[PDB]
Design an enzyme around this catalytic site. Structure first.
Site, PDB file in Angstrom:
ATOM      1  N   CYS A  59       0.678  -1.184   0.096  1.00 33.76           N
ATOM      2  CA  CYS A  59      -0.029   0.031  -0.065  1.00 33.76           C
ATOM      3  C   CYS A  59       0.749   1.235  -0.092  1.00 33.76           C
ATOM      4  O   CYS A  59       1.879   1.409   0.586  1.00 33.76           O
ATOM      5  CB  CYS A  59      -1.285   0.145   1.031  1.00 33.76           C
ATOM      6  SG  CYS A  59      -0.235   0.444   2.742  1.00 33.76           S
ATOM      7  N   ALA A  62       3.730   1.957   2.250  1.00 30.97           N
ATOM      8  CA  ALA A  62       4.587   1.117   2.048  1.00 30.97           C
ATOM      9  C   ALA A  62       5.864   1.988   0.918  1.00 30.97           C
ATOM     10  O   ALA A  62       6.708   2.652   1.204  1.00 30.97           O
ATOM     11  CB  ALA A  62       5.061  -0.052   1.579  1.00 30.97           C
ATOM     12  N   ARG A  93      13.164  -2.634   4.998  1.00 28.55           N
ATOM     13  CA  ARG A  93      14.468  -2.602   3.619  1.00 28.55           C
ATOM     14  C   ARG A  93      15.231  -1.694   4.518  1.00 28.55           C
ATOM     15  O   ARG A  93      15.630  -1.388   4.719  1.00 28.55           O
ATOM     16  CB  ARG A  93      13.247  -1.422   3.542  1.00 28.55           C
ATOM     17  CG  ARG A  93      13.847  -1.228   1.721  1.00 28.55           C
ATOM     18  CD  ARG A  93      13.466   0.282   1.317  1.00 28.55           C
ATOM     19  NE  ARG A  93      13.173  -0.043  -0.174  1.00 28.55           N
ATOM     20  CZ  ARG A  93      13.263   1.346  -1.006  1.00 28.55           C
ATOM     21  NH1 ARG A  93      13.376   2.678   0.050  1.00 28.55           N
ATOM     22  NH2 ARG A  93      13.050   1.621  -1.946  1.00 28.55           N
ATOM     23  N   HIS A 192       4.817   6.420  -3.706  1.00 32.50           N
ATOM     24  CA  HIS A 192       5.824   6.970  -4.973  1.00 32.50           C
ATOM     25  C   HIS A 192       5.218   8.437  -4.930  1.00 32.50           C
ATOM     26  O   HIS A 192       6.076   9.462  -4.698  1.00 32.50           O
ATOM     27  CB  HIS A 192       6.393   6.484  -6.399  1.00 32.50           C
ATOM     28  CG  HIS A 192       6.931   4.481  -5.797  1.00 32.50           C
ATOM     29  ND1 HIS A 192       6.920   3.777  -6.821  1.00 32.50           N
ATOM     30  CD2 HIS A 192       7.009   4.162  -4.781  1.00 32.50           C
ATOM     31  CE1 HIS A 192       7.098   2.809  -5.673  1.00 32.50           C
ATOM     32  NE2 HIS A 192       7.294   2.599  -4.944  1.00 32.50           N
TER      33      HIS A 192
HETATM   34  S1  CFM Z   1       8.474  -3.437  -5.310  1.00 32.94           S
HETATM   35 FE1  CFM Z   1      12.449  -1.843  -6.937  1.00 32.94          FE
HETATM   36  S2  CFM Z   1      10.401   0.269  -7.532  1.00 32.94           S
HETATM   37 FE2  CFM Z   1      10.597   0.167  -5.876  1.00 32.94          FE
HETATM   38  S3  CFM Z   1      11.126  -2.195  -2.340  1.00 32.94           S
HETATM   39 FE3  CFM Z   1      11.561  -2.275  -5.159  1.00 32.94          FE
HETATM   40  S4  CFM Z   1      11.338  -3.706  -6.916  1.00 32.94           S
HETATM   41 FE4  CFM Z   1      10.214  -1.305  -4.155  1.00 32.94          FE
HETATM   42  S5  CFM Z   1      13.937  -0.435  -7.124  1.00 32.94           S
HETATM   43 FE5  CFM Z   1      12.759   0.152  -5.035  1.00 32.94          FE
HETATM   44  S6  CFM Z   1      14.688  -0.779  -3.627  1.00 32.94           S
HETATM   45 FE6  CFM Z   1      12.347  -1.709  -3.280  1.00 32.94          FE
HETATM   46  S7  CFM Z   1      13.448  -3.962  -4.090  1.00 32.94           S
HETATM   47 FE7  CFM Z   1      12.385   1.093  -7.231  1.00 32.94          FE
HETATM   48  S8  CFM Z   1      11.707   1.551  -5.261  1.00 32.94           S
HETATM   49  S9  CFM Z   1       8.211  -0.313  -4.834  1.00 32.94           S
HETATM   50 MO1  CFM Z   1      11.171  -3.661  -3.175  1.00 32.94          MO
HETATM   51  S1  CLF Z   2      -3.004  -1.298   4.829  1.00 34.31           S
HETATM   52 FE1  CLF Z   2      -1.995  -0.425   9.542  1.00 34.31          FE
HETATM   53  S2  CLF Z   2      -1.762  -3.020   9.515  1.00 34.31           S
HETATM   54 FE2  CLF Z   2      -3.102  -2.219   8.020  1.00 34.31          FE
HETATM   55  S3  CLF Z   2      -4.721  -3.006   9.702  1.00 34.31           S
HETATM   56 FE3  CLF Z   2      -3.038  -1.128   9.693  1.00 34.31          FE
HETATM   57  S4  CLF Z   2      -2.337   0.162  11.687  1.00 34.31           S
HETATM   58 FE4  CLF Z   2      -2.613  -2.264  11.494  1.00 34.31          FE
HETATM   59 FE5  CLF Z   2      -2.652  -1.784   6.551  1.00 34.31          FE
HETATM   60  S5  CLF Z   2      -0.203  -1.426   5.937  1.00 34.31           S
HETATM   61 FE6  CLF Z   2      -1.379   0.404   7.375  1.00 34.31          FE
HETATM   62  S6  CLF Z   2      -3.858  -0.371   7.447  1.00 34.31           S
HETATM   63 FE7  CLF Z   2      -2.429   0.235   5.928  1.00 34.31          FE
HETATM   64  S7  CLF Z   2      -1.127   1.799   5.703  1.00 34.31           S
HETATM   65 FE8  CLF Z   2      -1.254   0.678   4.526  1.00 34.31          FE
END
Ligand code: CFM
Ligand code: CLF
Ligand code: SF4
Ligand SMILES: [Ca+2]
Ligand SMILES: [Ca+2]
Lengths: 477, 522, 145, 522
Positions: A59, A62, A93, A192
């Protein structure tokens, strides 16, 4: 495997799915054709995921907090919302950095507002404010603060932008509000972008009138590298040995300051196109700065990039560019000599995020490796374009592949080695097929650069020719 | 550079002079970092008593928590049932971390799905994501049962799991007798352990609520065992083993001990063993129901006593000599089976060990943390050994618990300097270990850092971390360990005493300095 | 049951030959024998193996490391009448006691038990010119009776 | 000085300024010690390749051996029999060390006696010390059987154990049917493992030699199992466990797994379980006899094949994935029982683990040592893992063995840089680890020193010792470990990979220096 054969496979596989799903999925699977230049004619991407199919996607959060912001070492990132998100991504990461942890650098740290029954009820815009003060008091040396909003923030109208403006102004400190609520978008991608924008709006143009920074006709900035296991540093050194001067790294071991001086550069070197093309195109308008994308995976692609880059400067640079390649020729060749044999002809299958799925092909071929199938977890159409050119003929392509799907393909194609994420690593190992985390370098790396390749090889080796594999089948079976 | 013969990875690659001089420029040149001398200043500051006071006054900020959200536990729980597929009704990004988290801890495949709800559903919920979702899942991974949980989103916009599920059946997306239990699991309430409680409860209902008529307590001569949120395989096992060795008929409710240790024989199993549905359906007929980790199974005890009408005993998590006794006993009392010589001996041995090495454990200050039952059991045991559990922290604990613990501490000379904290995080603990320094920390990997820090201040200040808990990522296969029962006691006792001796060796290995106390026999 | 004999004498007088033929005749009778050249000249086996010059321990040892780096497999050879023969090895010009190279060759055979083997005889062809402590070796260690 | 509140023991007491300035005077004043700078010189020297050459040329001097004498093994073996009292016919001082040694390793009471022979018997042997001795022992500790061994003295002056024993019966010092087996065990021959061989053999005879008429191979449907000299309780067990899980009828000959782990219940047991005499008497009727540690049971295999007429298989000590398979198989073949799913799985798991963490173990140089079977099995397994057993030392091994090992090494890519050494001691190994440095040493506590030394030279030179073997005194309860079978493989695999990771953490804990590779997830 023939083309008419692969096509059949995909069909035999979709026979399980229910109508509706069986359709959308059919659109995300294709048999590569190095000819085509327009992806839209065979594979569609960046669309909402089908429910219940066990995707590997993630998501915005992340894609924002864990992907772009979290990497900056001097700022403090707040996982605004319930404790959940903040905890899982903590130090998950390996985006390395140099600094005294807890004092002037905070990456392998988890800052969260930790929402509770009441914060959801009466909003926690209040808490967020108080929070910052507590922050500012306990980690003084922090050169900035961010607010990566988790799923509940946007759902309860809380207004962080304000708090930021206010508190930020009130403390003469930068504060970035990020609307990276997981529900927005369908992948890590929208994150991003959301992130990129954020970066621009609240940080980028902070030193436009300021011209005290002494520049040089060789200044550059690495955009798109997250120093995974030190990737950045391995790439950085080449550029500098090449004579150039990289002012910043986004966001591998990067700092807010490094980011601020990014407009004072002559050339933007973008690695992960999909992750930061957004801030590049902008930097081109609001700064007229040029941006080109490179690749440092495997001696071949690397060399090729080093020159294509030197070619954007004078002789002094292009001469050094050759001095470098020269210096390392003995090394990378000596490596190929040792491992190339131990790998020649082995077929590989990949499935990563939005860049590596293709970027690493070169490196693999440089070791006689054959990539019989690759695919993206969240890449956009423009990514597959650049892709179809690298992947061989009659190969297999999959977008946002499904657990089931990925599993069945492997069973038929029977690759000699699978390179993917952690939610996979263990599945295919039980099936007896060597696996390497193409995400986290399986806690190894770096893989970028020359000193990198050396390892990339050594690794592919150890894992692919490890004896353990010859022991799965029991003797009495 | 690299010597094809002896390749260096991230480390110690970057220790090479060039990389050194490389990063040095980057620093001075564009980082605009605070003069070292400042960093050294600020740091030293955080290791002070003054910083602590300021730290403990935190209200809105939380640094390095020590708990996860509900769903994480709902997932795990659900995994304990035959061909059951954990389904988390909410944003997909969550499920990502879930699997991803457990995988790193178990180094096994964690199977779980999500009905990928998005923005376009923050207005009209996901009555559709459910419909299609349940169908897709059932037809793809062909499970026997699908347990539904929820994510942050799902609850905030508020969706009725029951309804949605009832419609997905009505509208024909999934059979009407297809087991689909459910439970709401708001991230913002309690920790992950709470998820488990809920989830489990949710399943208990689905199989015993609408049919308590033909049920009659004691009709099967078995005892139900609810493990709660357990991450150490070896535990599930030792329980089964002890009981089976006792001749007791049991029904372990929620057993993931199989899918978390599928063997590597060439084929991938997404499911393996686990509590059959029939086992659940019949449970009510069990003589009684024991809760291994009570402190976070209240919503279950309620239901169990309330519906099934069982007289759940007041038992503590079976850790350490004492409690485990009580457990075995109560089990006897219920089952009517005598405690077998076998266990009478295992015990005796656990005691032998204790006497064999108290001398080393005696008077050893520890700082620890984890979940309620776990933590208190660890505390209890350390006391049985003669150690001083000085910093018992527990982020997800409550007041009622804190009291019970203090009660346990107050009942032992070795609890004089013991302090229990709830709601506090690892950044707090960081201070407690600087100001009032212990000899070791007993906790999860997140504590690996606290160690680094204690060292940065100095060797004589470093506090070695002893990994016992969850999650654990910087070590392998520890999840096969065992903490429950006498088997467990032994393991921990060893992991301890040896951790101690391990370090005493390191402190006296200095040639012609301290190597005089580097005895061979200890 | 196994007799350990050693033939001593001046050089350049057919000693090695007589010895070897002796063993040969000794073989026909049915006695399993083993010869161990202790003559710096190294030529005490040629007549049994037909070889021009067998590989001395000291040679193959310096093409492996120390001593037990190799194996009797390429040091001990079976020629006519199944006789087993090994040549010690000439001492390194200027540096090295001939006797030394002997013991090391014996002790090696002792270790891989080239002896315990139904051997009825074992002849140590030893040069007895300048009867020093070096050439006296096989007698001092009490390996020759 | 001391703060009644925080008392300091030997360490770090003597780090107090006064003790420092105290010892300083004593040194300069009366020790006449070599100027530091020399000590530093000499030392550095020993860590060189030149010193090695000189070291390996040792003939008469032995520094820090890695074996014990025969009797030590004859005692242990004898302990594996019901109410049997180990009796060592010789000087009493010996028995002292024996018990004293084992106690330190087992932290259990070792029961063993001696007929205290003295100077006054160096002329007329001890035909009396035997007479009175056997009587006194029998009437005091009332054992069911007394196994007799010998010490250095006894053999040199040469006493006929058989005769002396036959007279002690004739003259009426002890009943004529009282079991009193015997075996000569000269200190100066082979190591301790040889004692076991002998002793065992000596008992085998005493119960089967004079009565092989009514014996008929295969008549009992059982398999005899001779463990040899084993010091890891967990082993004896795993064997029993695997077999019992396989439905195989077995007869473990020499089982001390009970007297070496008597429980702490208020009463002392000098005896406990163990191979009954009847078990031995009947052994001949066993389908066959498997030797767990063959490489040091030749004197038994002979007797077994020679008398009992069993076709002892060519099996290797069951350690590591591969061999253990072969063991189970051969056992099947003999017994006629299929390999149960149970074990098929345990195995699969062992493999999972291997794949789960090869990355870390791959290309890891180890230097190890111990006994023949143990060492070779360790070697075999390290190869199955992808490690490079560079320094395989084994003081008590022989040439025949060295060959078998080299054969094992040569059959694997991971054995290129492998070198096997026999007859060499720990002082030799000391050099091998300085010149051609490995990453860890896998051996007993005697190696704790070698580590100290590797560190004295420098951190980057230190080689962490990984305790696995015998004896072990600087750690507790490791003797409850397990090395045989799949259970074993697993333990070792973990002890390893983790020891590795354990150290990598230590090398990257430096704040803002190397702490960048201090990953959380590994
Ligand atoms: S899955 Fe890179 S577009 Fe992004 S965490 Fe990894 S294949 Fe990321 S290289 Fe990056 S350093 Fe990454 S490997 Fe571009 S930043 S969303 Mo999972
Ligand atoms: S889509 Fe966060 S893990 Fe989730 S049920 Fe969450 S506290 Fe527990 Fe998910 S990871 Fe979080 S709620 Fe999210 S922004 Fe993205
Ligand atoms: S003993 Fe004889 S052969 Fe050996 S060194 Fe002396 S003189 Fe030369
Ligand atoms: Ca696994
Ligand atoms: Ca004991």
């Amino acid at each position: 495997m023939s083309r008419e054969e692969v096509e059949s496979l995909i069909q035999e596989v979709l026979e399980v799915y229910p109508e509706k799903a069986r359709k959308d999925r059919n659109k995300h699977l294709a048999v590569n054709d190095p000819a085509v230049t327009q992806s839209k004619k065979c594979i569609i991407s960046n669309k909402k995921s089908q429910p219940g199919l066990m995707t590997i996607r993630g998501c915005a959060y992340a894609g924002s907090k864990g992907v772009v912001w979290g990497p900056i070492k001097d700022m403090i990132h707040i996982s605004h919302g319930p404790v959940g998100c903040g905890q899982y991504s903590r130090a998950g990461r390996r985006n390395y950095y140099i600094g005294t942890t807890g004092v002037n650098a905070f990456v392998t740290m988890n800052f969260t507002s930790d929402f509770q029954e009441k914060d959801i009820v009466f909003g926690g815009d209040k808490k967020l404010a108080k929070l910052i003060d507590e922050v500012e008091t306990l980690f003084p040396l922090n050169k900035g603060i961010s607010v990566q909003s988790e799923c509940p923030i946007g759902l309860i109208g809380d207004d962080i932008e304000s708090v930021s403006k206010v508190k930020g102004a009130e403390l003469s400190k930068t504060i970035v509000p990020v609307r990276c609520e997981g529900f927005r978008g369908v992948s890590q991608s929208l994150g991003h972008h959301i992130a990129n924008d954020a970066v621009r709006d609240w940080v980028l143009g902070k030193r436009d009138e300021d011209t005290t920074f002494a520049s040089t006709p060789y200044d550059v900035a690495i955009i798109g590298d997250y120093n995974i296991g030190g990737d950045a540093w391995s790439s950085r050194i080449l550029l500098e040995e090449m004579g150039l001067r990289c002012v910043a790294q986004w966001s591998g071991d990067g700092s807010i300051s490094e980011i601020e001086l990014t407009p004072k550069v002559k050339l933007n070197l973008v690695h992960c196109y999909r992750s930061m093309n957004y801030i590049s195109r902008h930097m081109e308008e609001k700064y007229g700065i040029p941006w080109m994308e490179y690749n440092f995976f495997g001696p071949t692609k690397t060399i090729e990039s080093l020159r294509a880059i030197a070619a954007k400067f004078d002789e002094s640079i292009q001469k050094k560019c050759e001095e470098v390649i020269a210096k390392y020729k003995p090394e990378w060749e000596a490596v190929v000599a040792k491992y190339r044999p131990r790998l020649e002809g082995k077929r590989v299958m990949l499935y990563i995020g939005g860049l590596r799925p293709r970027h690493v092909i070169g490196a693999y071929e440089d070791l006689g490796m054959e990539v019989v199938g690759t695919g993206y977890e969240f890449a956009h159409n423009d990514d597959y374009d650049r892709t179809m050119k690298e992947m061989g003929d009659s190969t297999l392509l999959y977008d946002d592949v499904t657990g089931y799907e990925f599993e069945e393909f492997v069973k038929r194609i029977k690759p000699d080695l699978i390179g993917s994420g952690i939610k996979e690593k263990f599945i295919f190992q039980k099936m007896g097929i060597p696996f390497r985390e193409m995400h986290s370098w399986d806690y190894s790396g770096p893989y970028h650069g020359f000193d990198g390749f050396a390892i990339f090889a050594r690794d592919m080796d150890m894992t692919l020719n490890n004896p353990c594999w010859k022991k799965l089948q029991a003797p009495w079976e | 550079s690299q010597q094809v013969d002896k390749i260096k990875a991230s480390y110690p690659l970057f220790l090479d002079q060039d990389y050194k001089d490389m990063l040095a420029k980057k620093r001075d040149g564009f980082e605009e970092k605070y003069p070292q001398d400042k960093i050294d200043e600020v740091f030293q500051w955080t290791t002070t008593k003054e910083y602590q006071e300021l730290n403990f006054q935190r209200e809105a900020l939380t640094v390095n928590p020590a708990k996860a959200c509900q769903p994480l536990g709902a997932v795990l729980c659900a995994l304990g049932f035959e061909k059951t597929m954990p389904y988390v009704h909410g944003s997909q990004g969550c499920v990502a971390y879930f699997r991803s988290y457990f995988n790193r801890h178990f180094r096994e495949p964690v199977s779980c799905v999500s009905d990928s709800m998005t923005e376009d559903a923050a207005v009209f919920g996901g009555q559709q994501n459910m419909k299609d979702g349940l169908q897709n899942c059932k037809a793809t991974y062909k499970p026997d049962m699908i347990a539904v949980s929820t994510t942050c989103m799902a609850e905030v916009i508020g969706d009725d799991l029951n309804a949605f599920i009832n419609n997905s059946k009505k509208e024909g997306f999934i059979p009407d007798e297809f087991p689909v239990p459910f439970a709401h699991t708001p991230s913002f309430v309690g920790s992950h352990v709470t998820g488990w409680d809920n989830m489990f409860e949710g399943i208990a209902r689905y199989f015993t609520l609408k049919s308590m008529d033909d049920k009659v307590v004691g009709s099967n001569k078995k005892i139900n065992i609810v493990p709660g949120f357990e991450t150490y395989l070896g535990n599930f096992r030792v329980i089964k083993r002890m009981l089976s060795e006792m001749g007791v008929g049991y029904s372990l409710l929620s057993d993931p001990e199989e899918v978390l240790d599928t063997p590597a024989d060439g084929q991938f199993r997404m499911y393996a063993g686990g509590t059959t549905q029939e086992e659940m359906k019949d449970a009510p007929n069990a003589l009684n129901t024991v809760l291994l980790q009570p402190w976070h199974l209240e919503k279950t005890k309620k239901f169990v006593e309330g519906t099934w009408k069982h007289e759940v005993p007041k038992l503590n998590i079976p850790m350490g000599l004492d409690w485990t006794d009580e457990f075995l006993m109560k089990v006897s009392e219920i089952s009517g089976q005598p405690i077998p010589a076998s266990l009478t001996k295992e015990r005796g041995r656990l005691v032998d060990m204790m006497t064999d090495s108290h001398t080393w454990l005696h008077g050893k200050r520890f700082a620890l943390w984890g979940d309620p039952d776990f933590v208190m059991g660890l505390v209890k045991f350390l006391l049985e050994l003669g150690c001083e559990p000085v910093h018992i922290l527990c982020h997800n604990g409550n007041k009622r618990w804190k009291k019970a613990v203090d009660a346990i501490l107050a009942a032992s000379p070795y609890g004089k300097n013991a302090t229990v904290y709830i709601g506090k995080d690892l950044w707090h603990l960081r201070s407690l270990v600087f100001t009032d320094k212990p000899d070791f920390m007993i906790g999860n990997s997140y504590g690996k850092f606290i160690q680094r820090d204690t060292l940065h201040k100095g060797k004589e200040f470093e506090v070695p971390l002893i990994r016992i808990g969850f999650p654990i990522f910087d070590r392998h296969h520890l999840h096969r360990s065992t903490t429950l029962g006498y088997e467990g006691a032994m393991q921990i006792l060893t992991t301890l005493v040896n951790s101690i001796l391990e370090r005493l060796d390191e402190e006296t290995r200095g040639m012609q300095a301290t190597d005089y106390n580097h005895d061979l026999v200890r | 049951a196994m007799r350990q004999c050693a033939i001593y004498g001046k050089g350049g007088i057919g000693k090695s030959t007589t010895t070897q033929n002796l063993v040969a005749a000794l073989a026909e009778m049915g006695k399993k024998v083993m010869i161990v050249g202790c003559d710096p000249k190294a030529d005490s086996t040629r007549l049994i193996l037909h070889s021009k010059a067998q590989n001395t321990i000291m040679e193959m040892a310096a093409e492996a490391g120390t001593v037990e780096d190799l194996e009797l497999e390429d040091v001990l050879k079976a020629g006519y009448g199944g006789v087993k023969c090994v040549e010690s090895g000439g001492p390194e010009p200027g540096v090295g006691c001939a006797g030394r190279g002997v013991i090391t060759a014996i002790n090696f055979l002792e270790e891989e038990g080239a002896y315990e083997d139904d051997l009825d005889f074992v002849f140590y062809d030893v040069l007895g010119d300048v009867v020093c402590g070096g050439f006296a070796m096989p007698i001092r260690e009490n390996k020759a009776q």
